[PDB]
């Protein structure tokens, strides 16, 4: 059940390829394009693409959103 | 070297332990103010590399610094 | 009242601009070296840069030369202060606030003549801000 979760994320990340500016190696900028955006500078820009623009993960497991149409 | 203003071809790995010695004996009011990191080997090579966080955030983070990095 | 002195405030250290430029960064084993023809070269750009803010924006005419630009505390590291004088009116400073505005105009063009890339030529308070990326 969960190790064909594994691969829809090993295939997410396969779809993502192609293009020579990989989407992990940049942060986004904010609404007003002066500096990057406040979790990816304090983090690294590859921890703002696997758990804010993949995962889209919350704080905690009892509370939980939506089914999230991209990883469906 | 930003701090005491010195040349950037006279500080480096072999001698960094043996100027900084030199920078408080000089001026020990200008040396309180700066800040110097505690890095070393085996606190970066023993990490959180917990699940779903190896073919994610560690080897997607390499590969980003190979050329050709579409390929890989 | 305060008895005694510091030496380390000037009557011009208001105005003042930071330089601070890295040439090993840059180009490493194959960077010129900085002498007094160098600073030349940077006190006419500086000046070039003045001319063409006061006549692109504020619609004069004044010619700013290379002994208007006047540099003190030029340390190894290569670092120095500058601040920009009327050209005959010594008394005469102009300020902070619109040396930054000529500076942020003219950066892409200072960094051509020295081959500095905006991390090798850094203006200590004047930051690059532009640039969002995309093209999908
Ligand atoms: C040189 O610049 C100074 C300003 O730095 C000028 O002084 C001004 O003079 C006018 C009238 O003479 C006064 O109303 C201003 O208050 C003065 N400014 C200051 C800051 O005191 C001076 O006139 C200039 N000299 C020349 C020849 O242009
Ligand atoms: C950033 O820009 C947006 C315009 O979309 C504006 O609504 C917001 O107030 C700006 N934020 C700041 C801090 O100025
Ligand atoms: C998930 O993303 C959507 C938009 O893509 C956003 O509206 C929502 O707030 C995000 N969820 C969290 C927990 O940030
Ligand atoms: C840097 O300068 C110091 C003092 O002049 C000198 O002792 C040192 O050898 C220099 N470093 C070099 C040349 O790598
Ligand atoms: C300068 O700092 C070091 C520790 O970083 C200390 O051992 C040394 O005694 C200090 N020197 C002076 C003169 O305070």
Same mark, same amino acid.
């Given at each position: 059940?969960?190790?064909? %979760? ?47 623009? %993949?995962?889209?993960?919350? %704080? ?13 | ?34 800040? #110097? ?6 606190? #970066? ?28 | ?12 250290? $208001? ?6 430029? +890295?040439?090993? +960064? ?9 002498? $007094? ?6 006190? +006419? ?46 008394? $005469? ?44």
């Amino acid at each position: 059940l969960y190790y064909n %979760t594994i691969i829809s994320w090993i295939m997410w990340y396969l779809f993502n390829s192609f293009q020579e500016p990989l989407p992990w190696s940049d942060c986004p900028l904010n609404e007003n394009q002066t500096g990057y955006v406040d979790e990816c500078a304090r983090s690294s820009p590859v921890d703002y693409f696997w758990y804010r623009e %993949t995962l889209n993960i919350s %704080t905690s497991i009892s509370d939980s959103g939506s089914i999230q149409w991209w990883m469906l | 070297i930003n701090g005491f203003d010195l040349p950037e071809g006279n500080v480096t790995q072999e001698n960094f332990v043996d100027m900084q010695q030199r920078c408080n004996a000089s001026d020990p009011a200008a040396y309180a103010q700066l800040v #110097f990191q505690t890095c070393d080997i085996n606190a #970066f090579l023993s990490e959180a590399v917990e699940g779903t966080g190896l073919a994610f955030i560690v080897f997607t983070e390499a590969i980003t610094k190979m050329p050709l990095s579409p390929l890989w | 009242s305060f008895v005694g002195w510091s030496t380390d405030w000037s009557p011009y250290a $208001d105005q003042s601009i930071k330089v601070r430029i +890295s040439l090993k +960064s840059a180009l490493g084993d194959k960077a010129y070296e900085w002498n $007094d023809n160098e600073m030349y070269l940077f006190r +006419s750009s500086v000046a070039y840069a003045m001319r063409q803010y006061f006549l692109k924006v504020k619609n004069q005419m004044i010619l700013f030369g290379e002994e208007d630009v006047r540099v003190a505390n030029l340390k190894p590291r290569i670092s120095f202060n500058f601040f920009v004088t009327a050209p005959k009116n010594v008394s $005469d400073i102009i300020p902070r606030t619109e040396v930054e505005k000529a500076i942020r105009m003219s950066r892409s063009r200072i960094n051509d003549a020295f081959r500095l890339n905006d991390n090798s030529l850094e203006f200590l308070g004047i930051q690059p801000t532009l640039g969002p990326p995309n093209q999908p």
